[PDB]
């Protein structure tokens, strides 16, 4: 079963970011994508009223693995491929940026 490919995009467009099991978010916030110029490293950053999202690409995984995301058709049997970087995303809260004295007693 040989499946045909319609188009391949080597330019930044769509990205995938892993958080944790059971992540919902407000679904109205934006994520700013960044790029560095052999292999390009990507950085993700988002902002919310109570939360803040920060993501980056693994240096050991980027140079060795190349991730791609595609859309499949049930009748045409053609996939539209687009390169997507995997960003290890962490979420920081309002509770952060809290600290005591540098030297205590």
């Amino acid at each position: 079963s040989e499946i045909e490919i319609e188009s391949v995009q080597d330019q930044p467009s769509v990205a995938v970011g892993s958080f944790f099991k059971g992540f919902r978010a407000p679904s109205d916030t934006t994520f700013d994508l960044y790029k560095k110029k052999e292999k390009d490293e990507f950085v993700l950053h988002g902002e919310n009223e109570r939360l803040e999202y920060e993501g980056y690409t693994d240096s050991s995984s980027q140079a060795s693995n190349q991730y791609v995301v595609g859309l499949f058709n049930p009748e045409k049997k053609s996939i539209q491929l687009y390169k997507a970087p995997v960003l290890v995303s962490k979420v920081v809260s309002k509770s952060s940026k809290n600290l005591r004295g540098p030297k205590i007693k």
């Binding site: 995984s61 995997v86 962490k90 509770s95 952060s96 940026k97 809290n98 600290l99 005591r100 205590i104």
Partner: protein, 787 residues
Amino acid sequence: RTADFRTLERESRFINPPKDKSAFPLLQEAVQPHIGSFNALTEGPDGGLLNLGVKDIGEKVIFDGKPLNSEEISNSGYLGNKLSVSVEQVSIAKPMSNDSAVERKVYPSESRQRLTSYRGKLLLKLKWSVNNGEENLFEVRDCGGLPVMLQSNRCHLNKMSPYELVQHKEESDEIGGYFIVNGIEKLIRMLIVQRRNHPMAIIRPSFANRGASYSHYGIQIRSVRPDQTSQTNVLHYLNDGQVTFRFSWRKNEYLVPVVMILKALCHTSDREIFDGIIGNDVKDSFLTDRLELLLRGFKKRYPHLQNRTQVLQYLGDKFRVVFQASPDQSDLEVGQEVLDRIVLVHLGKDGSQDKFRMLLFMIRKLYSLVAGECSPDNPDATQHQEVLLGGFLYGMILKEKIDEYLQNIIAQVRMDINRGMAINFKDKRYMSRVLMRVNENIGSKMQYFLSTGNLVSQSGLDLQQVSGYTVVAEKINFYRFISHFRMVHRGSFFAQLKTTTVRKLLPESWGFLCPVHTPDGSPCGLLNHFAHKCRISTQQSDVSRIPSILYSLGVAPASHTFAAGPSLCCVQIDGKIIGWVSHEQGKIIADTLRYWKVEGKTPGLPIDLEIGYVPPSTRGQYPGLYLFGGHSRMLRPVRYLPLDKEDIVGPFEQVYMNIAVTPQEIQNNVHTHVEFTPTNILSILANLTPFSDFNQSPRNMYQCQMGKQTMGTPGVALCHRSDNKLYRLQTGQTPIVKANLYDDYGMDNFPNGFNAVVAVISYTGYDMDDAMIINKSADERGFGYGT
């Protein structure tokens, strides 16, 4: 047509010592773990262990008792002038003798005759940084005569050919590996220590009797720094359902909750810890409850610690006194200093993400051991251990003495500022004054260790014993002398135990530890000897190119996958968890790696690499693809069936490997390797025993002890020696009946006996069980005469 003795070849070599490559390379291969270990102290990549060690001990801070006088609240907070003292480089010189002006070369022969030590000048570039490098002062300080190892990187004999060695009053095929200390040849004995960078699930009743509600179950990883210094981290499962992190600083043990040490490494959520330990096996009620105990317990005990910085500050505040990191260092700095110096040091600094992943794996392995999913790893077994080489041990104690040396400089400055006040740190005069009031003779401190074997240290290293690290390289005969450099001890601490499991000869030792060569009585099963073809790892290479090969072979990255447990295969390279795969694919990667390993077509995969695959089992060992490349590893050559080429195997990976003894015993679909010769499983002395496969087991063992106590040949360069006592057989003879390996070790250079006409007869009546008769006329003719 025969397996003859070289008579014409022998006598020609006796008169003509070769000017090219020395004969009998196996003899130099016997002292390979000793010389190699000491060679890696200065030579090799990263500038040697000694330059790495001074790079790890870092700075030593002290502040001047002087005010700021600024036109203020800054004055009260002002600690004074900063003084950060460290050591950038470490130099070792070959033995020399100055007479004050021009230096002259001093050879080992001289040191023996003079009844002195074969010392080399130890130099180290001291860094005197003031107010965080606003003015730096450097001085190459002479730190005494460091005893140098013979035929090593810093010995005058290493280049010398057999001809040159004889012309310099040494043996034609001089092995080395020892130190000449006050005329006595002393060697650092090899030790059996826990395999580096591997989580070990262990059941110990010792863990229970230490604290309250402590179980037998626990995990133990022996993390090793690039400078070969070790730092063991232990995980404890409490009956409450709590997990605690055990470690050691100075000579004291410290306990911290694992959920605290996890949150200090990198910013994570409680669910990130949950996904990190519990994978797709979310329905496992046993795990569901235990993890709730950890997370709720941390929230109950430390509700204030809500971010990575607060956790680091809480850690810094409680350890500011023990880690001595003060008085300008913040609790955030001290907190990180604790982490970088204690938690999984094998992954090192700028690898907190790697330390976090490895810690979660240890918790899951701990819970698999409690439940019973995983069988406990045996520390006494050869598969879960490596060999601490003398040269590495020497480098560790050296790193300790230079740390002490820097502490003493600060101690002198503290004495100065607490009395007469003297002057400032920017003046070179003051530095020179402090430096000559400090005991800088590290050479004598290192000479002491080689003269007593007593380990004097502030940390005590990652070792149990404190004595017998050094032994006299007894040269009563060559057989005893060569066996010293192939002898390995479990530890002095293990000798005083009622346990017999430690002394038991195990199948894990096949081809690594000799089954015959072990003493009778008290050192039985403790004082082992390696196999003649066994080798020990001196360093590692191409290790950084292997994750790229693994990721291409289908290994899913651990940072994106987020799934852990014995249900899936864990891929690790020198304790660095790189990814996750299925157990089916796990073997496929392990088999394909070995194929490209023996093939010289792959540049990033070295032949000396250990591919430790552990298949899934019902209540067996914890599964995974634990690869190794590091130092101290036990290695042996075998013939790999496909391609018909040499392959290097370790004791960890061998357990699941099918290696046929003889090529005629190779069974289809159940064999992957074959032995070159079965003689590879025995020691040098064990191989030398004629027809040993026809003698009863304890008689072959007793012969090793006998050949060691025989009055044979201790050397031929005796007219340039001055040893306590030597035993010399006058009429040495070559055996008619002999193993061919006798020639491979050139044992004809040192005859141990004589060929005699022996009659199995009961005639005289004076011979019976423990008594034998010697011929008078034979004795009168000089038979068995010695001096």
